[PDB]
Amino acid sequence: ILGGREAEAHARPYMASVQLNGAHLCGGVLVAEQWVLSAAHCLEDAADGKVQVLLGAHSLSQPEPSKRLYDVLRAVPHPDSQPDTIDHDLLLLQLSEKATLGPAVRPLPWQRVDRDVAPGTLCDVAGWGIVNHAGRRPDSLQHVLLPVLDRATCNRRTHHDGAITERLMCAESNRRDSCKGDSGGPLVCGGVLEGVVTSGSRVCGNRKKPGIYTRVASYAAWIDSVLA
Ligand SMILES: NC(=O)c1nn(CC(=O)N2CCS[C@H]2C(=O)Nc2cccc(Br)n2)c2ncccc12
Numbered sequence: 001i002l003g004g005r006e007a008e009a010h011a012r013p014y015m016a017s018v019q020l021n022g023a024h025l026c027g028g029v030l031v032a033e034q035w036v037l038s039a040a041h042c043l044e045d046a047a048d049g050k051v052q053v054l055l056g057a058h059s060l061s062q063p064e065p066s067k068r069l070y071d072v073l074r075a076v077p078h079p080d081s082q083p084d085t086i087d088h089d090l091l092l093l094q095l096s097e098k099a100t101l102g103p104a105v106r107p108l109p110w111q112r113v114d115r116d117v118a119p120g121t122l123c124d125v126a127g128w129g130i131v132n133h134a135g136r137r138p139d140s141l142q143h144v145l146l147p148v149l150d151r152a153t154c155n156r157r158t159h160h161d162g163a164i165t166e167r168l169m170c171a172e173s174n175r176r177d178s179c180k181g182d183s184g185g186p187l188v189c190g191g192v193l194e195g196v197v198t199s200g201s202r203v204c205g206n207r208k209k210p211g212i213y214t215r216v217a218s219y220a221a222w223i224d225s226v227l228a
Pocket residue numbers: 024025026041042043044128129130137138178179180181182183197198199200201202203204
């Protein structure tokens with residue numbers, strides 16, 4: 001998270017850290033007792049390595065009572081997801097067992113009505129992604145409040161030149177933005193999950209290249225299908 005603040009410990013109990021060989025890769029969001037929603041291309045180049053989902057965390061390294069690790073029993077990517085496109089950038093991870101729920105571990109209600117978040121709405125994006133262009137990896141959870149950007153502006157040739165479909169959404173990226181590692185992380189508006197940070201490589205912190213987030217409501221039927 002570029003231009004953010006360290007988040008209040010365990011204030012976002014839905015926050016998950018998708019890790020490979022005990023190293024953070026992507027953010028994730030607890031949507032059910034045994035399901036974590038993330039971005040499609042997070043497990044890319046993972047291959048030979050231990051994939052695990054860290055729950056109840058604030059510091060990635062320090063001991064915390066709430067901190068628990070889960071094996072991934074099943075990894076369900078969206079059927080139409082491909083590394084060449086930023087489209088259908090969703091991944092549903094089934095944990096080995098149901099999450100031990102508590103004040104620091106709680107699933108987030110996600111948007112089940114396909115209606116765009118009104119431009120200018122302030123949304124909260126959190127994660128353990130890089131905090132500066134050099135690439136500083138933060139130990140503790142960071143977060144930033146960003147206003148939702150009008151798709152028309154976002155699709156300008158100077159911006160994402162039409163790449164932003166009706167299934168995607170934008171947020172402002174003027175210094176304060178999401179970045180490498182924030183992928184698969186949640187975009188929350190009015191305490192409801194609205195978007196999922198894309199896992200597609202992009203330029204961060206430049207205002208003319210807005211942050212891209214997958215609209216969960218746009219994939220509500222698929223998510224329901226998998227979870228059931
Ligand atoms: N949404 C983004 O801004 C974004 N996502 N990605 C993809 C992305 O972050 N990922 C997809 C493969 S696993 C994950 C990734 O590269 N994670 C990572 C790498 C180094 C440090 C940290 Br903390 N996290 C970007 N890559 C480069 C620049 C920006 C991004």
